[PDB]
Amino acid sequence: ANPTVRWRMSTSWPKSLDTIYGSADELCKRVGQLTDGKFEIRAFPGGELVPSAQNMDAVSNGTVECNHVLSTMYIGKNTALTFDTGLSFGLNARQHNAWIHYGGGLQQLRELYKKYNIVNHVCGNVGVQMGGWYRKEIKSTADLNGLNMRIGGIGGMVLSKLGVVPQQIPPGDIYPALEKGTIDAAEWIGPYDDEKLGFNKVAPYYYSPGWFEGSASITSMVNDKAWEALPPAYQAAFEAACGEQSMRMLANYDARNPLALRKLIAGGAKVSFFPKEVMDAVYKASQQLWTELSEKNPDFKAIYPGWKKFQEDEAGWFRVAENALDNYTFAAVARAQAKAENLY
């Protein structure tokens, strides 16, 4: 019989986010079901076992067996981690999971993570994020200069090029900073989570889109010795649960975000698109950053050329069919809705 195994999972999230934290809980729950309770993983909210800033190191050290994180919180350690979470203007969620599981990505990331005593698993995605919450209007790239912005992931490094001062403030600590004015702006994820955390109460302007990542993919880093110690059925249980949550976390966001955005607008949130001039500047800054990271970090250089070719192939294909139909359907659905609303 397979042994009884007890793990701790240190997440980076508050329990109140029944989207991203809820998915960590589901993951743990499913592993229990699969192993008849013998493989017991207990999830902990951000900051409870260690500060979320320490969640990668805590796994590498064996302090906890695994975590549930945004890997590019740890770009200070290695910027190549951005291939795991997502690059600015990068792959969308579909394309990212394609790259990871059938495009050779997982193997390249496993090699990277091995250096830090980690076996990595993709275990979620939150899709395209919003552009965040701003106290003052963003009219041009000039408005970014000197901006104190809470932002997670590689997009902070991009925005730095345009004068933004970024901070990866943990989610539960964003609101007081925004309320006090020690930051001017904050992005987190999207309508459902953002409404829960309360940012609309203290910033009137909500921009789109969150170009910061093509999709923000979520990772469970596992300690290599903890992983190797598992029997094959338990390794499979963890893999399968992660694969399943790679669909379910985003399914929950997709299900919950629309009503949340409706509520936000009804409550007074002013929602609009970033100006084209801003989009073009942050796109240009992104591309410059990849050149710089390739030249500075051999681990980034090793992955980028193949990743870029994969994005070129994926974007080209999605323009042919996937996005051709979605563009048509979304517009037709909107027209039909407008027609019904105006039928009186």
Added chain:
Amino acid sequence: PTVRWRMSTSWPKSLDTIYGSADELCKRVGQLTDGKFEIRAFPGGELVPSAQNMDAVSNGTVECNHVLSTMYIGKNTALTFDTGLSFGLNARQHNAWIHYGGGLQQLRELYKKYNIVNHVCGNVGVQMGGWYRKEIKSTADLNGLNMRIGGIGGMVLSKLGVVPQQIPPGDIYPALEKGTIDAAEWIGPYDDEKLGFNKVAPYYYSPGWFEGSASITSMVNDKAWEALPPAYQAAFEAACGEQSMRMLANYDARNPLALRKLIAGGAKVSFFPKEVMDAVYKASQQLWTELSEKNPDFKAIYPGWKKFQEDEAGWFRVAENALDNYTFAAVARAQAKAENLYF
């Protein structure tokens, strides 16, 4: 406990995308149970004709299948909510509806009538529009067309004078070669190239509006399901949930190279005219009204499903589609600029 199941799929083994996903599913269930829960997948037609795969599960001939549920619209057209409606939800939205929008529970009530416990276990995304001998310049070119097409889109196209046939995948090419059909859609570049349609039809149209996404189902005999211990049920559910991501991830990875190969070999890739798109969209909407009036099981699901699509499309237009449209265009522009070509 050693449990041995047969899974009757609808697909040729050569499709290492959709059939390979069925194999992966079975393989994962084995891993999760240390070999104890053994499911063996069989290609289309091997145990029963794929046209019989739903009935073979209902009457317990096999424990489960791996199918396009709208192959069986002749039995109940409300099955289209499982697979997908024409101009329906995209894959993400469909999985959202199923798992967090109440879709799965509504489908379970429908399927119980047929002694089935259903699980979503894959998706092939937005399909291509198919293979044609003659250009499609207007809806007039659809009138009288003999077309191989799977799923509810065949019913939509019937309204424009198409005669649809749900010919099994391994039998499409000979019909197209011989000329007993004028046109055929299957799925997309990787599978279509594998099956060989480009050898006998010059025109490849886009997009396959037939489903917003073609979702794949494993129908499980309800007595076979009920007998399983909880860990084995969880193994099957998790394997299905994982393949709901992995099958489409494999198609996404493979399709771009296959399309390049197809074009390099002479396939002419074209978009349906706006006039055709508008016509099939209109016919789709007319069909849902008719199916709602004729089939109480369809009427029961449609209003809530429609509201869910409205909510989803409204939200995706704000951020998801805004960034995808910007990025896909930027990637193309950068490609052109690298070759000193105009974009």
